[PDB]
Write a protein that binds this ligand. Structure first.
Ligand SMILES: CN1Cc2cc(ccc2S(=O)(=O)C2CC2)NC(=O)CCc2cccc(c2)[C@@H](Nc2ccc3c(N)nccc3c2)C1=O
Ligand SMILES: [Ca+2]
Lengths: 250, 55
């Protein structure tokens, strides 16, 4: 995250840190005690599917304070329409091997209904994006969880305001074109969370863009509202052998 | 009715045959008698920040 601030410990309680062989991979969002939403592109280079760990209640990577909860990722579910190395349909649904325990530091973000998200949440201007990604383009990643407030744009407006891929109906732009504030590649999979009448909801996933906080370019986020039905149906399904599952979309 | 200001609902809104509207709530919440407000039914409802709620 470029140009944000440290998220005070426990104020981003749905933030997930994904690890592969103990190394920082991506962010994610806890949506109930066993399911995490992340980006499909987070898993393009994975060979060690059994060394994939989700950490909840994380804040500072340098110290263990006892609020962290680690779980093995039992399943990674990706839409059939997602093509590795590309931008469209950038979403993954992760089943934890054992549920996390909800506490003051581990709380799920609400996955909203599609109608509510499209007709109300899509019009809330600002939303928060968070993660332990790059603090600067070509710079170090953060040791403390960072958060940034970003405004959402209508796709026609994003296309008009951008300098020099397509922005599909499965994406939306958010951020600033002045190069000061953005989420980065290391924040990939993390939440874009929207506040409405006292409650936070999942509206986007940190997905793609150019460099980080590049002048003339906005951050591009997976439009979660397009996937509500797809996610709900998978959450009602029985686990299948093998970590990676490709599921038909729609 | 749901298209306009979320039909007055705090969370979810369902339109019915005519001028009828029903508000609903995510799991871990119940609808109050006002027919619009959602109150938590669990210790850690989704989308609420405990350290801020307890403040
Ligand atoms: C460059 N990487 C790493 C990556 C990428 C792809 C696959 C695997 C990896 S991986 O390293 O194995 C991954 C981290 C574990 N897939 C593709 O290249 C296509 C989609 C895509 C296009 C451009 C940029 C990105 C992603 C980056 N992500 C982002 C995310 C948000 C951005 C933002 N908001 N502003 C600027 C740049 C922002 C950049 C990316 O992940
Ligand atoms: Ca820690």
């Amino acid at each position: 995250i470029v140009g944000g601030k440290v998220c005070p410990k426990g104020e981003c309680p749905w933030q997930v840190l994904l690890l592969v062989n103990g190394a920082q991979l991506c962010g994610g969002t806890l949506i109930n005690t066993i399911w995490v939403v992340s980006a499909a592109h987070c898993f393009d280079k994975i060979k060690n599917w059994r060394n994939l760990i989700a950490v909840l209640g994380e804040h500072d990577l340098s110290e263990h304070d006892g609020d962290e909860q680690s779980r093995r990722v039992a399943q990674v579910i990706i839409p059939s329409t997602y093509v590795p190395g590309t931008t469209n349909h950038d979403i993954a649904l992760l089943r934890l091997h054992q549920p996390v325990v909800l506490t003051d530091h581990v709380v799920p973000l609400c996955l909203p209904e599609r109608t509510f998200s499209e007709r109300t949440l899509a019009f809330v201007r600002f939303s928060l994006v968070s993660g332990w990604g790059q603090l600067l383009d070509r710079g170090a990643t953060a040791l403390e969880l960072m958060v940034l407030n970003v405004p959402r744009l209508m796709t026609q407006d994003c296309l008009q305001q951008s300098r020099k891929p397509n922005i599909t109906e499965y994406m939306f732009c958010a951020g600033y074109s002045d190069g000061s504030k953005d989420s980065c590649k290391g924040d990939s999979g993390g939440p874009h969370a929207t506040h409405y009448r006292g409650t936070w909801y999942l509206t986007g996933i940190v997905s793609w863009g150019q460099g980080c906080a590049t002048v003339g370019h906005f951050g591009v986020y997976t439009r979660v509202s397009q996937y509500i039905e797809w996610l709900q149906k998978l959450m009602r399904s029985e686990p299948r052998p093998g970590v990676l599952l490709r599921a038909p979309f729609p | 009715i749901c298209v306009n200001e979320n039909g007055g609902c705090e969370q979810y809104c369902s339109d019915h045959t005519g001028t009828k509207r029903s508000c609903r709530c995510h799991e871990g919440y119940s609808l109050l008698a006002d027919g619009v407000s959602c109150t938590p039914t669990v210790e850690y409802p989704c989308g609420k920040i405990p350290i801020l709620e307890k403040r």
